[PDB]
From a paper:
[name], a recently identified innate immune adaptor protein for endolysosomal TLR7/8/9 signaling, is recruited by the lysosomal proton-coupled amino-acid transporter [name], and then activates IRF5, which in turn triggers the transcription of type I interferons and cytokines. Solute carrier family 15 member 4 ([name], also known as PHT1) is one of four members of the SLC15 family, which belongs to the proton-coupled amino-acid/oligopeptide transporter (POT) family and the major facilitator superfamily (MFS). The architecture of [name] lacks a bulky soluble domain and the TM domain contains 12 TMs that mimic the canonical major facilitator superfamily (MFS) fold, with TM1 to TM6 forming the N-terminal bundle and TM7 to TM12 forming the C-terminal bundle. Here, we report three cryo-electron microscopy (cryo-EM) structures of human [name] in the apo monomeric and dimeric state and as a [name]-bound complex.
Notably, the co-expression of the C-terminal strep-tagged [name](1–20)-EGFP and C-terminal Flag-tagged [name] gave rise to a clearly observed EGFP signal that served as a rigid body to facilitate 3D alignment. Finally, we resolved [name]/[name](1–20)-EGFP complex at an overall resolution of 3.03 Å, which was of sufficient quality to allow confident modeling of the [name] and the N-terminal region of [name]. The human [name]/[name] complex occupies a volume of 60 × 55 × 45 Å3, with a stoichiometry of 1:1 for [name] and [name]. A solvent-accessible vestibule, formed mainly by TM1, TM2, TM8, and TM10 of [name], extends from the intracellular, cytosolic region into the TMD. At the deep end of this vestibule, the binding pocket of [name] is negatively charged. The N-terminal helix (residues 1–14) of [name] protrudes into the binding pocket of [name] by approximately 25 Å and entertains a number of interactions, enabling it to form a stable [name]-[name] module. The amine nitrogen atoms of the main chains of TASLL2/S3 were coordinated by SLC15A4E465 via hydrogen bonds, while the side chains of TASLE4 interacted with SLC15A4R48/Y86. Similarly, the side chain of TASLTyr6 was coordinated by the side chains of SLC15A4K384/D385. During [name] binding, helices 1, 4 and 5 from the N-bundle and helices 10 and 11 from the C-bundle move in opposite directions to enlarge the cytosol cleft to further accommodate the binding of [name].
Author numbering:
A (entry chain A): 32 to 135, 150 to 267, 299 to 356, 361 to 520, 525 to 558
B (entry chain B): 1 to 14
Write the structure that this text describes.
Amino acid sequence: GRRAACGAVLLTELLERAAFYGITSNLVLFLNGAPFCWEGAQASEALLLFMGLTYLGSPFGGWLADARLGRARAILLSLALYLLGMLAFPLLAAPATRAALCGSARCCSPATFAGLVLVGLGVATVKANITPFGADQVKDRGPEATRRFFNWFYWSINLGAILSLGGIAYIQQNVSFVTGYAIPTVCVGLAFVVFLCGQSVFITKPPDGSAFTDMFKILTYSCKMSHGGPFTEEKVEDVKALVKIVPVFLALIPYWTVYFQMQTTYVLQSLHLRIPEISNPHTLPAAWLTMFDAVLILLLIPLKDKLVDPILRRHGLLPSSLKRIAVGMFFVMCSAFAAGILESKRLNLVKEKTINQTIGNVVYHAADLSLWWQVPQYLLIGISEIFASIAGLEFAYSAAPKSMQSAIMGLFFFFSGVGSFVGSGLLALVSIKAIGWMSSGNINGCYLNYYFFLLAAIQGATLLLFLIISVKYD
Amino acid sequence: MLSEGYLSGLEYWN
Ligand SMILES: *[C@@H]1O[C@H](CO)[C@@H](O)[C@H](O)[C@H]1NC(C)=O
């Protein structure tokens, strides 16, 4: 009956996530190549801006879907734009057609910026709109049907990301870039075809109107006021609740900065470490580290929720949401410290010994030290993620009315994107000639350890301020 | 982020 509609949503989400993670994983290696004479800092900033845009356009995508247009039509248009970007990327990667784009230190900046902008907007709208759509397609049956559907959605997202980070990343790093970038385009084309042909069997609703319009109208009109202006008391109470919720995300911003460093600068460091070779010369993909962290997250969340939580509740001593957020930020602190220590050790070691390794088309003068010592940073990032990202939304939901979902998620994604933008801005600020931290794709002449220590220090200041505020709050 | 798969249906105890 409804399996023709739920399956289409599941498949579309799987293909979309596979394409997105295929693009994001090997973008730093792609830009730091032959067609583009981009440095490490510039490529890291570009990928950080791309991720920040993808996560910051989500509230605007939701407002576009709800206030006007529609939900299904918004997903369709976003998939069209995202496929346009997925056609822009391989046409640029192929040597033959790159001449038509940019034949005559950013060789093809306009094309690689237009493609990134279009992909970011499409991904933002699809990510903001697909989950309410999937919930709507099954909400009629009952809570248990929605629970089963969202178990399937959880697994679909995980397998999409894992299959991407394994296969597409391996192909892009070792086999070629044209095929490894056409595969996500084929995935997006299949997703678009599935959604277009599956549109007739979908259950759609007219545009209702998100709470963002009421938020902005109240803010422009304006403790606020009750039953004095046109707005009702319930809307004012909801806006006050959201204002009370915002500071948690405002404090979580540096957390998301350090998190989104995961596959921007940690990947660069991994490229500049000694990556093992797994074939007679196919090196290990640099995205397999974040794939391993994702596998750890999948293996641990059921483990956590089924072992730690039940006995913790039975024996007491359970921590509140804010304590879990603080623990997550402390683990982020430790991850940044570990990254700084590793980078300092690598920079001290490379002063005399360096081995030339090739990863794709470009040759990296890596150090002797092995890649596997970077595992603690990724493990700490994953543990901090499970401790903090979930607890933040749990607290926000516990402090918001039950009628305001998809607005908590919108603000959460918006502040995550703001954190990514802040990280990119900090990298650019330390990239100036006044400081000269990264004013030397080789980062051996740069100072990445100082940048990692700065991230750790700002995270520490934020954590101490958060704890001092939370003592009074609790 | 890698946790958004779990965060998508958090209210349903995903
Ligand atoms: C690294 O590559 C450069 C350019 O090919 C070369 O001059 C240098 O000898 C290489 N170093 C090592 C250690 O292979």
